[PDB]
């Protein structure tokens, strides 16, 4: 069972820009989540080979991770903050779809999602 190619972190013809909200998302929101104790399983694409998860990409068809999100923010992949947030929401949702209520990884994702939502409320006005 091979790995799919990871999600793109740059695209010539996908519209993109910088906003102060996207700056906040990188320097504050992503940074704090990256540093959290529970971040590590979310810091790179699911390696279905070496983690022995042969069914992962059978269930999950739109994978996302914080490694991808960080690269995207650094490269200014996004048009707005809402597109980035959708990538975080995809990451969390994948975890909840693939796993079961109360699983270790699900409990970690909920803790990260709680901190994310808190950080998201203090997002600059423009
Ligand atoms: C967050 C992405 N992700 C999973 O949804 C998932 C499910 C099961 C194992 C692993 C996984 N393998 S692991 O060795 O880091 C792992 C972490 C935790 Br927390 C609990 C169990 C486990 O492997 C069995 C890495 C990333 C993910 C998963």
UniProtKB/Swiss-Prot annotation:
Organism: Homo sapiens (Human)
Subcellular location(s) of the protein: Nucleus; Chromosome
Domain comment (free text): The NET domain mediates interaction with a number of chromatin proteins involved in transcription regulation (NSD3, JMJD6, CHD4, GLTSCR1 and ATAD5). The C-terminal (CTD) region mediates interaction and recruitment of CDK9 and CCNT1 subunits of the P-TEFb complex. It is also required for maintenance of higher-order chromatin structure.
Function according to Swiss-Prot or TrEMBL: Chromatin reader protein that recognizes and binds acetylated histones and plays a key role in transmission of epigenetic memory across cell divisions and transcription regulation. Remains associated with acetylated chromatin throughout the entire cell cycle and provides epigenetic memory for postmitotic G1 gene transcription by preserving acetylated chromatin status and maintaining high-order chromatin structure. During interphase, plays a key role in regulating the transcription of signal-inducible genes by associating with the P-TEFb complex and recruiting it to promoters.
Further facts: JQ1, a thieno-triazolo-1,4-diazepine derivative, and I-BET, a benzodiazepine derivative, have been tested on tumors with success. Treatment with GSK1210151A (I-BET151, a I-BET derivative) has strong effets on mixed lineage leukemia and promotes myeloid differentiation and leukemia stem-cell depletion.
Protein family membership: Belongs to the BET family.
Post-translational modification note: Phosphorylation by CK2 disrupt the intramolecular binding between the bromo domain 2 and the NPS region and promotes binding between the NPS and the BID regions, leading to activate the protein and promote binding to acetylated histones. In absence of phosphorylation, BRD4 does not localize to p53/TP53 target gene promoters, phosphorylation promoting recruitment to p53/TP53 target promoters.
Domain of life: Eukaryota
Bromo domain location: 17-123
Residues annotated as site: Acetylated histone binding: 99
Illness association: Cornelia de Lange syndrome 6: A form of Cornelia de Lange syndrome, a clinically heterogeneous developmental disorder associated with malformations affecting multiple systems. It is characterized by facial dysmorphisms, abnormal hands and feet, growth delay, cognitive retardation, hirsutism, gastroesophageal dysfunction and cardiac, ophthalmologic and genitourinary anomalies. CDLS6 inheritance is autosomal dominant.
Phenotype for residue 99 to A: Abolishes binding to acetylated histones
Subunit and partners: Interacts with p53/TP53; the interaction is direct. Interacts (via CTD region) with CDK9 and CCNT1, acting as an associated component of P-TEFb complex. Interacts with RELA (when acetylated at 'Lys-310'). Interacts (via NET domain) with NSD3, CHD4, BICRA and ATAD5. The interaction with BICRA bridges BRD4 to the GBAF complex. Interacts (via NET domain) with JMJD6 (via JmjC and N-terminal domains); the interaction is stronger in presence of ssRNA and recruits JMJD6 on distal enhancers. Interacts with NSD3. Interacts with NIPBL.
Cross-link (Glycyl lysine isopeptide (Lys-Gly) (interchain with G-Cter in SUMO2)): 58
Stretch of the intact protein here: 44 to 167 of 1362
Protein name, UniProt field: Bromodomain-containing protein 4
Tissues in which the UniProt entry reports expression: Ubiquitously expressed.
């Amino acid at each position: 069972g091979s790995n799919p190619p990871p999600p793109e972190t740059s695209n010539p013809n996908k519209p993109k820009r910088q906003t102060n909200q996207l700056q906040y998302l990188l320097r504050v929101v992503l940074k704090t989540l990256w540093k959290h104790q529970f971040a590590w399983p979310f810091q790179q694409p699911v390696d279905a080979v070496k983690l022995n998860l042969p069914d992962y990409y059978k269930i999950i068809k739109t994978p996302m991770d914080m490694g991808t999100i960080k690269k995207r923010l650094e490269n200014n992949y996004y048009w707005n903050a809402q597109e980035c947030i959708q990538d975080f929401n995809t990451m969390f949702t994948n975890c909840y779809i693939y796993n079961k209520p109360g699983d270790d990884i699900v409990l970690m994702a909920e803790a990260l999602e709680k901190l994310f939502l808190q950080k998201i409320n203090e997002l600059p006005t423009e």
